[PDB]
Amino acid sequence: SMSYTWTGALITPCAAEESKLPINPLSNSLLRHHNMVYATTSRSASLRQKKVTFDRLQVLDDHYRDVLKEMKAKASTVKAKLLSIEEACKLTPPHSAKSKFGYGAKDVRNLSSRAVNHIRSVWEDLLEDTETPIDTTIMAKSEVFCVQPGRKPARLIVFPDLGVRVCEKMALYDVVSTLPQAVMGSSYGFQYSPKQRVEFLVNTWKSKKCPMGFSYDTRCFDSTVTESDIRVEESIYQCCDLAPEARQAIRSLTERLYIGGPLTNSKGQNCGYRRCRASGVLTTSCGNTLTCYLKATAACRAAKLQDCTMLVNGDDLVVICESAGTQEDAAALRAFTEAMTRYSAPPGDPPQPEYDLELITSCSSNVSVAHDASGKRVYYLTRDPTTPLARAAWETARHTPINSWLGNIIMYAPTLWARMILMTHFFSILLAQEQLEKALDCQIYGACYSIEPLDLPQIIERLHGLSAFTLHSYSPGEINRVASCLRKLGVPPLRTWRHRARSVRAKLLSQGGRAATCGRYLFNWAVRTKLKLTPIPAASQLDLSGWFVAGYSGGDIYHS
Ligand SMILES: O=c1ncn(Cc2c(F)cc(F)cc2F)c2ccc(Oc3ccccc3C(F)(F)F)cc12
Ligand SMILES: [Mg+2]
Ligand SMILES: [Mg+2]
Numbered sequence: 001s002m003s004y005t006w007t008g009a010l011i012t013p014c015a016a017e018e019s020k021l022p023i024n025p026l027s028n029s030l031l032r033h034h035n036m037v038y039a040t041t042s043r044s045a046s047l048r049q050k051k052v053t054f055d056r057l058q059v060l061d062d063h064y065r066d067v068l069k070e071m072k073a074k075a076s077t078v079k080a081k082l083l084s085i086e087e088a089c090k091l092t093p094p095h096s097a098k099s100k101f102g103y104g105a106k107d108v109r110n111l112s113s114r115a116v117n118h119i120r121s122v123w124e125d126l127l128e129d130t131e132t133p134i135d136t137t138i139m140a141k142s143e144v145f146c147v148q149p150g151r152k153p154a155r156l157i158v159f160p161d162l163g164v165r166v167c168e169k170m171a172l173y174d175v176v177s178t179l180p181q182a183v184m185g186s187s188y189g190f191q192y193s194p195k196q197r198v199e200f201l202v203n204t205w206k207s208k209k210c211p212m213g214f215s216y217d218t219r220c221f222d223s224t225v226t227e228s229d230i231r232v233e234e235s236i237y238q239c240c241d242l243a244p245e246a247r248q249a250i251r252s253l254t255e256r257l258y259i260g261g262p263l264t265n266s267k268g269q270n271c272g273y274r275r276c277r278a279s280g281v282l283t284t285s286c287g288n289t290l291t292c293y294l295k296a297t298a299a300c301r302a303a304k305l306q307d308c309t310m311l312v313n314g315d316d317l318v319v320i321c322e323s324a325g326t327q328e329d330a331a332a333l334r335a336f337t338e339a340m341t342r343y344s345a346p347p348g349d350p351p352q353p354e355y356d357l358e359l360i361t362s363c364s365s366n367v368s369v370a371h372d373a374s375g376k377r378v379y380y381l382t383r384d385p386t387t388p389l390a391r392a393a394w395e396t397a398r399h400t401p402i403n404s405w406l407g408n409i410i411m412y413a414p415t416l417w418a419r420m421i422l423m424t425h426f427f428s429i430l431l432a433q434e435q436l437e438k439a440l441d442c443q444i445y446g447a448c449y450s451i452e453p454l455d456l457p458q459i460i461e462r463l464h465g466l467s468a469f470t471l472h473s474y475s476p477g478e479i480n481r482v483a484s485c486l487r488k489l490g491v492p493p494l495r496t497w498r499h500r501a502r503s504v505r506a507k508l509l510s511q512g513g514r515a516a517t518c519g520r521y522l523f524n525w526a527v528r529t530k531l532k533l534t535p536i537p538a539a540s541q542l543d544l545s546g547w548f549v550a551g552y553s554g555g556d557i558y559h560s
Contacts, residue, residue: 003223004053004263006272011045011140011156014266018398019043027397030389030425032490036147037390040154042140047153052223056276058344060228063298068232071294072239074183079241080175085116085123088169092162093448093558095401095441097137099162108166122163123170126252127245133261136160136278138271144391144404146489157554159280160257165556168282171249175237176286177550183236184293189313189363190285190445190551193463193544194381194411197311201367202379204309204320205357212323212353214333215362216296216340219348221315222277222284225291226344230259230277232294233287258283285446285551288314295343303335311362313445314551318362329353358477370414370474372467378414380464380471382478385417385485392422393489396429406451407442413460414468417482421491423522424501427453431507436515446553450560454514457521461539463547469521469533501526 021027021037028034089108098104103115140154159165180188192200205211218224234254242250258281263271277284293312296319300308306322319336323329333353340347354360358368365383372378392405405422412418430436430453439450451459460468486493492500501523508519521533546559 001227001275002053002055003276004049004272004274006049006053007270009265009267009269009271011042011049011138011271012266012269013042013140017041017043017142021394022397024397026429027393030393030396030421030491033488034393036489037144037393038147038151039142039144039394040140040152041142042154044151044153045140045156048140048156051153052156052220052276054223056224056226056344057342058226058228059342061298061302061342063301063339064294064343066301067294067298068235071183071290072236074185075179075236076239078175078179078182078239080172080178080246082243082246083170083173085119085166085170086111088166088173089116089119090560091169091173091557092166093556095448096165096556096558097159097162101161101163103162105162108162118163119166123167123245123249126167126171126249126256130248130252130255132256134160134164134257135264136257136261136274136280138263138265144387144394146386146390155279157280158263158274158278159554159556160278164257165282167249168253169557171246171253172237172282175240175242175250176283176552176555179237179240180286180289180550183290184310184312187293187310187312188289188550189311189316190289191548193548195464196548197363198367198379198381201311201318201320201357204311208307208320208322210323211320211357212329212355213318213320213357213360214351214353215360216317216319216337216351217348218292218315218317218340218345221288221292221345222279224344224346225277225288227259227275229291229344230254230287233283233290234258236290253283257281258287279554280556282552282555282557284554285314289551292317292345295340295345299336299339299343302339303332305332305336313363314553316363318360323353323355326353358475368475368478370416370471370478373470378467378471380414380468382412382415382417385415385421385482386489388412389417389421389485389489389491392425396425401441402448403440403442406440406453407444409456410442410451410459410463411444413456413464414471416474416478417485419522419525420482420494420497420501421486424497424504427508427518427522428500428504431504436518444547445551446555446557448558449547454518455538457514457517458536458538458542459544460521461536462542462544466533466535469524472525498526 019041021034092108094105096105101118107115136158141157260275265271289312308321311318368382369377388408409422439452441450505519505523509516
């Protein structure tokens, strides 16, 4: 069936949208070529639509069916609990889209009478009406990017009302948090932290006689998901031991929301219908990971690749396996792509076999190596810095709910570009404005969190280790990239940052307390007469456990 159907009403913006980076003092400090940084707007919606509207093709074979039963089997060991309206509410973000029935995130969190009552009514309705499609809103997502040798058209987000959103949590939160791990095991990418991911990738790579690996990029994965996929995905869920209320709630959510439904723009007009994955639902991240895994796993048996190992994060896939030769490997990869195409997961960029792990990119990131004080090789997770910086620049000029930079510092603490530019730029500013105290919301795997800037040293040591404060002698590959990028975005050179960092460091050490800590470990790279960085007290006390369990992108989740 057609992924989407449009009535002709436009996808409209519920306010004014900014497309160009504003010229201000602070941002200009990070990067000069501001006219290269832009943000998507509903304006390009039409273009997106054309890219995602098409008629799917799907042919399931015995390998598909086989793997499904295999996955079903493990899922059947799971027992998911129901969530009280409280727990679910406590999980809703404060910025989350307000309800169209008279309440908002604020009220939902305050367990406000009006909110909780409507929520209660929506649940009751999911238990009674098993048919009626649930209404959803469509919006052109507004993200920041850098220009390229045109521009990326806005991404479309589909999401139900806050009422239906809380119920989803109640019926499926526990499910989408445990089930994936139980089903995919070592392959579930969200169970790992950057360091743990790197470890998994490097161990897998080494466990092979002669490694071969590739990243498979599906063309607009969501729109490729078919009504069959969603139903199959629900069947896995149905294997869990669930309360009747939840069993039915899930059954209803599947038929009324997940497999598809009506599209309403911000104005309130009917835009069309959806028959593919909705990006703004709780089951998006879990569902896409299950689906992608299912297809790829079966696709590897069809293509006859040997000893496949998958790493899946939603629609993001990377496979590592035993090579069979250059020629044979390209044939297998091609076979693989076709199998996946049959399964309704055609490629965007044709996959290319990789024999050098550092060259494989998944989750917009890759694996590289640097050295610690002792001088031994240390692998860490890194990525091209363009987007992070561009957004960083944008987040410096305008106030925005989420701070991609803070999240990036956290996830990329050990990288060259993260420590040299981001850490400096932002600490320098916070130091100026006197804001080191204020907490800031950010995101990890799609879930919002609230971190205090002055706690970064602890976070970084526990998630990466002390080496993240002393790495050096980065690969010539990584170095070239960073430099190439700064040159492109008009970002100040190495020396300029060192000088700036050298100054911030000083200003930080004078304030003492948690600040000196930041200045001591975070900017130790700047001073020549180094300092001995020892295990930080608060580090071995942080409950970062929950930070890396499952994915929630688009799932409207906030871990308080
Ligand atoms: O391998 C390194 N080993 C150490 N340092 C010092 C250093 C560091 F260990 C971490 C850090 F957080 C900031 C730093 F300064 C480097 C500093 C810059 C660099 O790369 C470049 C070299 C020449 C020009 C431009 C660059 C650039 F844009 F940085 F890539 C490579 C290295
Ligand atoms: Mg895709
Ligand atoms: Mg974990």
